[PDB]
Design a protein around this ligand. Sequence first.
Ligand SMILES: [Ca+2]
Ligand SMILES: [Ca+2]
Ligand SMILES: [Ca+2]
Ligand SMILES: [Mn+2]
Length: 579
Amino acid sequence: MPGHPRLLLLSGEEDALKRTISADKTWEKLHQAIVAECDQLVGIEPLKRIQIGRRLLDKSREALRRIFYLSYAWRMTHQLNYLQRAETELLTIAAFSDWNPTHFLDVAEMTMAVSIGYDWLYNDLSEQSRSTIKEAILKKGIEPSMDSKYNSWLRSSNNWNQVCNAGITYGAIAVYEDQPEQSKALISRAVSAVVLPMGDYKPDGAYPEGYSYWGYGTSFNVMLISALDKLFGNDFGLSAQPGFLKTAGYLENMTAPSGNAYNYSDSGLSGELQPAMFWFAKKLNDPSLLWVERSRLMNSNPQNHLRNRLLPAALLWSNGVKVAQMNAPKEAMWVGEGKTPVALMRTSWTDPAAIFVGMKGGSPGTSHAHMDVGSFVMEADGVRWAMDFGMQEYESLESKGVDLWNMKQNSQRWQILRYNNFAHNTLSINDELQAVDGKAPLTAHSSSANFMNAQVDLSSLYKQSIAKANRGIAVVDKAYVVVQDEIETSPAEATVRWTLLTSATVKVTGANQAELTKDGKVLTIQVMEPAQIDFKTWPTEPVYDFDAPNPGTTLVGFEVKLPANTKSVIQVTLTPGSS
Ligand SMILES: [Ca+2]
Ligand SMILES: [Ca+2]
Ligand SMILES: [Ca+2]
Ligand SMILES: [Mn+2]
């Protein structure tokens, strides 16, 4: 086993790292931003153990950012200021009464922070500082993780399992020589337990909870795998778990030409630089996975990156990648199954005016899901024409007493305007909510250049009102988008509402035609089937006083009555003015 440092970057490996960083202007400017941020940190006071409510998490995360940055800077520059400032942070945190195990993410992230510093600075620390820091890792990090009242995340399939197993494993590695049998058992515990959350990447790497939740668990899962690879030369089969390595392709393709994500489920629009993407691109020897991160590294203010507590890992995993001279990905379509299937289609990775469609199957009962099954977003000519409201801020909803996290059919969650199907780009039948027990599979797809498409079976989402419902969405002739619903009624008639949510200005120019205008661009909505419709708009204003305002948005669409015992088609085309 390597001695210290044994986490992520071994004893002499900074020298080769320096060479690749000096050979790339983009990596060099990131490295220098970190070094200059460390110069500022030298003059900033150590953290205090002050919670916000039940959580110390803001402090544990800042501790990770400070100690990772300073420890990286010390190993790369050997500036004494960085060593001493990091040591002061480590001794301060070691003196905390506890690292708040009743919200164990706080302990996990604090343990990772103190462990990286302990390990990366070990050879340059006094025996007294080593002993102080080691005892805090053991007594405030590792020991609470062995307590049944604190470690239920070992049984969970969510981000807590990945994050807590990663953090405690970093502790077990950092203090290995003080308790070898015990640390080996802790490493084994994490390797076995982390398979639970990794199951949800199967089979294709789509992330069931969507764009904003991808970062946390996945990144800590990668910190764990990478540390095992560097320490043991292997990861005990973790990276081979079905679908896990495919999740980098998922995240890359989730960014539309605008730079904004397909923000289904509880998600925001904007992302950030994701250091874990550079690990995936290194493990897979596939720099084409980094096309979106390239834009962030090249264009963004580096101050945006300097809030990222894992930022030095992006440089550790840089793998000699030459950012500016990267080639765009060859594949312009990405499809994945699993609990939340998605299809992500674009006409070009290089043309900023490209048509993009993101569409999803899945279930409203999935963690963080909305009643959005079969919905889509659409961009063209630099404008998002068909949108998704995204999440609503949790704190106000919870403080108001809204039953936000109940996923059952009758839950108050679905009385939140932004979360039910009347505000998403999909069907509502008989004025009903979607069935939360519904699960729409992706049944077929093609990346054919003139007919890129995907199809989902929506029947179980409308089980009580119709016999069958299938939806296809396609990009046709690289020129327009078609949304096609095929509905088979039961022996009862059904009323179907077709909905599109937009921030563009809406003008109904004909009985079957509407013009959307935004940012000096135009898109035309044409209802091809049925031939006879009454175009409508619906307000996006709050319905309940806990609904957030939605200024500048409009719902447009129509309703069709479908007779009993019939097979019917609804077909709508979306044609950019460029087309
Ligand atoms: Ca000693
Ligand atoms: Ca999960
Ligand atoms: Ca409003
Ligand atoms: Mn939504």
